[PDB]
């Protein structure tokens, strides 16, 4: 996560699961853009995207409404071996 | 026969009377708590807590509206 | 409390935010600036989120 790139896959766990996952891209540049991916697994949707760009010194998830002020902040789970580092979110609805 | 280490505490309600022979005791509710906090909250503050020891910790509280 | 009739800037040199019960009676009025944490030169867990503090 230093020196190299990285891999984000937030994982989308749901015990009662009702879920469409759109995705807009409207905004200024922050220089990271990436597609996000799909699966059809069992009560495991990992949504996988690369926008590791930039170093990475805090790293956080935020999710909720922002025009109301309703953000909830998740911790990641960075996996680094040798020069290849990956993150890992677990979202559980 | 029955013990004072029994008969727990009352934190929202004070007796007012009681009868000479202990007949018909006349209890009454207290108001609730200007700020805000329970009633059992502010008995276990004004007693028995905590032989002036602390401890700081990330509250566990969730989320503000 | 306060209402900006247009948008300026309020300096912050060290600060610390809170964290606040959902209680009736607490007035929020200000609110930490949504991309910000907390942290400390010990090895303890953040004490606030971005927008929570």
């Known amino acids: 996560q230093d020196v190299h790139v990285s891999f984000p896959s937030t994982a989308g766990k749901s015990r009662v699961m009702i879920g469409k996952v759109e995705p807009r891209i ?46 909830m902040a998740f911790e990641p789970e960075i996996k680094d071996n040798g020069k290849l580092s990956m993150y890992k979110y677990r979202i559980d609805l | 026969m029955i013990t004072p280490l029994d008969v727990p505490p009352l934190d929202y309600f004070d007796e007012v009377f009681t009868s000479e022979n202990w007949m018909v005791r006349i209890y009454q509710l207290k108001k609730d708590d200007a700020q805000g906090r329970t009633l059992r909250d502010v008995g276990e503050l004004t007693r028995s807590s905590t032989k002036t020891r602390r401890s700081i910790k990330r509250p566990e509280l969730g989320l503000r509206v | 409390v306060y209402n900006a009739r247009k948008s300026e800037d309020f300096v912050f040199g060290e600060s610390s935010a809170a964290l606040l019960e959902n ?11 949504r991309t910000s944490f907390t942290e400390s030169k010990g090895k303890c867990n953040s004490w606030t989120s971005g927008s929570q503090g």
């Open chain 3, 23 to 33: 209680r009736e009676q607490i007035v929020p009025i200000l609110n930490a600036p």
């Open chain 1, 26 to 71: 409207g905004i200024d540049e922050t220089v990271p853009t990436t597609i996000t991916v799909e699966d059809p697994n069992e009560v495991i949707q990992v949504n996988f995207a690369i926008e590791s760009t930039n170093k990475p010194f805090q790293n956080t998830l935020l999710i909720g409404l922002p025009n109301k002020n309703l953000e």
